[PDB]
Design a protein around this nucleic acid. Sequence first.
DNA 1: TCATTGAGCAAATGAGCAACACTATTCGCATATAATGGGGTTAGTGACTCTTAAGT
Length: 54
Amino acid sequence: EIGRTTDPVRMYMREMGTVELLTREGEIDIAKRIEDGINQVQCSVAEYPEAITY
DNA sequence: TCATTGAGCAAATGAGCAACACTATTCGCATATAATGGGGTTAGTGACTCTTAAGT
Protein backbone atom coordinates (compact mmCIF):
# COMPACT_ATOMS: atom_id res chain seq x y z
CA GLU A 1 0.00 0.00 0.00
CA ILE A 2 0.93 3.67 0.44
CA GLY A 3 3.33 3.16 3.31
CA ARG A 4 6.57 4.85 4.37
CA THR A 5 8.18 4.67 0.88
CA THR A 6 10.62 7.45 0.01
CA ASP A 7 12.18 6.46 -3.30
CA PRO A 8 10.22 8.25 -6.06
CA VAL A 9 11.13 5.65 -8.68
CA ARG A 10 9.62 2.93 -6.45
CA MET A 11 6.40 4.96 -6.27
CA TYR A 12 6.63 5.42 -10.05
CA MET A 13 6.88 1.64 -10.47
CA ARG A 14 3.88 1.24 -8.16
CA GLU A 15 1.81 3.82 -10.07
CA MET A 16 2.77 2.20 -13.39
CA GLY A 17 1.93 -1.29 -12.11
CA THR A 18 -1.81 -0.61 -12.35
CA VAL A 19 -1.84 -0.73 -16.17
CA GLU A 20 -1.35 -3.93 -18.17
CA LEU A 21 0.95 -4.87 -21.02
CA LEU A 22 -0.24 -4.72 -24.63
CA THR A 23 -0.90 -7.86 -26.67
CA ARG A 24 0.00 -8.64 -30.29
CA GLU A 25 -3.18 -7.14 -31.76
CA GLY A 26 -4.39 -4.40 -29.41
CA GLU A 27 -1.99 -1.58 -30.34
CA ILE A 28 -3.15 -1.72 -33.97
CA ASP A 29 -6.64 -0.98 -32.64
CA ILE A 30 -5.29 1.85 -30.46
CA ALA A 31 -3.43 3.31 -33.45
CA LYS A 32 -6.62 2.94 -35.50
CA ARG A 33 -8.45 4.94 -32.82
CA ILE A 34 -5.66 7.54 -32.93
CA GLU A 35 -5.98 7.78 -36.73
CA ASP A 36 -9.78 7.91 -36.37
CA GLY A 37 -9.43 10.93 -34.08
CA ILE A 38 -7.01 12.53 -36.55
CA ASN A 39 -9.46 11.83 -39.39
CA GLN A 40 -12.32 13.23 -37.29
CA VAL A 41 -10.47 16.46 -36.47
CA GLN A 42 -9.47 16.83 -40.14
CA CYS A 43 -13.01 16.20 -41.43
CA SER A 44 -14.42 18.73 -38.95
CA VAL A 45 -11.88 21.42 -39.87
CA ALA A 46 -12.44 20.64 -43.58
CA GLU A 47 -15.71 22.52 -44.17
CA TYR A 48 -14.67 25.80 -42.50
CA PRO A 49 -14.60 28.46 -45.25
CA GLU A 50 -12.13 30.95 -43.74
CA ALA A 51 -9.60 28.13 -43.32
CA ILE A 52 -10.01 27.41 -47.05
CA THR A 53 -9.29 31.06 -47.88
CA TYR A 54 -6.28 30.91 -45.54
C1' DT B 1 63.74 94.74 -29.60
C1' DC B 2 62.94 90.13 -27.02
C1' DA B 3 61.33 86.60 -23.35
C1' DT B 4 56.89 85.42 -21.19
C1' DT B 5 52.14 84.49 -20.90
C1' DG B 6 47.39 83.45 -23.07
C1' DA B 7 45.10 81.15 -26.81
C1' DG B 8 44.62 78.20 -30.44
C1' DC B 9 45.47 74.83 -34.71
C1' DA B 10 46.95 71.29 -38.31
C1' DA B 11 48.32 66.78 -38.06
C1' DA B 12 49.32 61.96 -36.52
C1' DT B 13 47.79 58.22 -34.00
C1' DG B 14 44.52 55.42 -31.16
C1' DA B 15 39.68 53.97 -30.79
C1' DG B 16 35.69 52.69 -32.83
C1' DC B 17 31.22 52.26 -35.60
C1' DA B 18 28.01 50.83 -39.49
C1' DA B 19 26.61 48.13 -42.95
C1' DC B 20 27.49 44.06 -45.51
C1' DA B 21 29.38 39.42 -47.07
C1' DC B 22 31.26 34.82 -46.08
C1' DT B 23 31.49 30.83 -42.77
C1' DA B 24 32.18 27.94 -39.02
C1' DT B 25 28.72 26.51 -35.00
C1' DT B 26 24.56 24.75 -33.21
C1' DC B 27 20.11 22.88 -32.93
C1' DG B 28 15.69 20.51 -34.64
C1' DC B 29 14.66 16.24 -36.65
C1' DA B 30 14.91 10.87 -37.90
C1' DT B 31 16.76 6.03 -37.44
C1' DA B 32 11.03 0.91 -38.53
C1' DT B 33 12.58 -7.53 -36.97
C1' DA B 34 12.24 -7.59 -31.84
C1' DA B 35 13.55 -5.44 -27.73
C1' DT B 36 8.01 -4.28 -22.06
C1' DG B 37 9.59 -3.56 -13.43
C1' DG B 38 16.48 -1.08 -10.41
C1' DG B 39 20.99 -1.16 -7.57
C1' DG B 40 22.87 -0.32 -3.19
C1' DT B 41 23.76 1.06 0.99
C1' DT B 42 25.32 0.28 6.97
C1' DA B 43 26.17 -2.51 9.41
C1' DG B 44 31.03 -3.94 17.21
C1' DT B 45 28.19 3.80 18.53
C1' DG B 46 26.82 6.44 23.22
C1' DA B 47 24.04 9.30 25.57
C1' DC B 48 20.15 12.28 25.76
C1' DT B 49 15.80 14.44 24.43
C1' DC B 50 11.28 15.07 21.98
C1' DT B 51 7.24 13.23 19.83
C1' DT B 52 3.94 9.51 18.79
C1' DA B 53 1.61 5.35 19.99
C1' DA B 54 -0.26 1.17 22.07
C1' DG B 55 -1.01 -0.50 26.85
C1' DT B 56 -3.23 0.22 31.94
